[PDB]
Amino acid sequence: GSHMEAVQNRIVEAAERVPGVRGVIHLRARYVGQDIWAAMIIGVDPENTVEQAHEICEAVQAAVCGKIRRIESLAVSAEAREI
Amino acid sequence: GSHMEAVQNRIVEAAERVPGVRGVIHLRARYVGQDIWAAMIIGVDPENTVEQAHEICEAVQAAVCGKIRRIESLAVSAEAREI
């Protein structure tokens, strides 16, 4: 089941190129029919505001849903990640 | 099924008395055996930091699990709420 490993990779790469994302902490993805439904946690600067972290999450969603073909549901939340 | 409405009320009141919580936005609660498992979204100042919002969520968890008897699982996340 490695068509899923390929896709997870592209999702991770896609997300990380959005401003403010410091790593994908967590990504769950499953096939629903021919579609992918995913849920993601991104690391963000602990000192970003809550409203900034929301904006980053939305940009990640737009970027991934925009770029990655079979993704039809993506939930994105944020956690503090110091690096 | 109104032993659940009573408990949801006490959870909401409990959470709202934690510093930085501006309303409970969402609370899902279910009985697992004789226990309650719940998941909650609190409103917080959009200008709090991410790390502050984490701390508020943890204080809500400590407060609710500490005070409300049959709750054995509580997940708490934060969303921006301007008021």
Numbering used by the authors:
A (entry chain A), B (entry chain A): 211 to 293
What is written in the article reporting this PDB entry?
One group of metal ion efflux transporters that regulates metal ion homeostasis and can be found in all domains of life is the Cation Diffusion Facilitator (CDF) protein family. One of the most highly conserved and abundant integral MM proteins is the CDF transporter MamM. MamM was recently proposed to function as a magnetosome-directed iron transporter required for iron biomineralization since its deletion abolished magnetite biomineralization and mutation of residues within the conserved TMD metal-binding site resulted in alterations of magnetite crystal size, morphology and even mineral phase. To summarize our results we present an alternative model for the CDF CTD mode of action, in which we propose that upon metal cation binding, the CTD induces conformational changes towards a tighter and more compact fold which allows the activation of iron transport through the TMD.
To gain a better understanding of the contribution of these binding sites to protein function two double alanine point mutations were also analyzed. In vivo the introduction of double point mutations in the central putative binding site (D249A and H285A) resulted in decreased Cmag values similar to D249A. Although the average particle number per cell was almost identical between the D249A and the D249A + H285A strains, the latter strain produced particles with significantly reduced mean diameters (−12%, P<0.001, Mann-Whitney test). In addition, this strain also showed a slower restoration of its magnetic response upon induction of biomineralization by adding iron back to iron-starved cells. ITC results for the central putative binding site double mutant (D249A and H285A) displayed a reduced number of binding sites (1.8±0.2) in reference to the wild-type data and therefore suggests that a single cation binds to each peripheral binding site. To confirm that these observed phenotypic differences are due to true transport function alternations, we also examined the expression levels of all MamM mutants, their ability to stabilize MamB expression, performed MD simulations for dimer stability evaluation and determined their CTD structures. (ii) All mutants exhibited an apo-MamM CTD-like behavior along the MD simulations, and (iii) an absence of structural differences was observed.
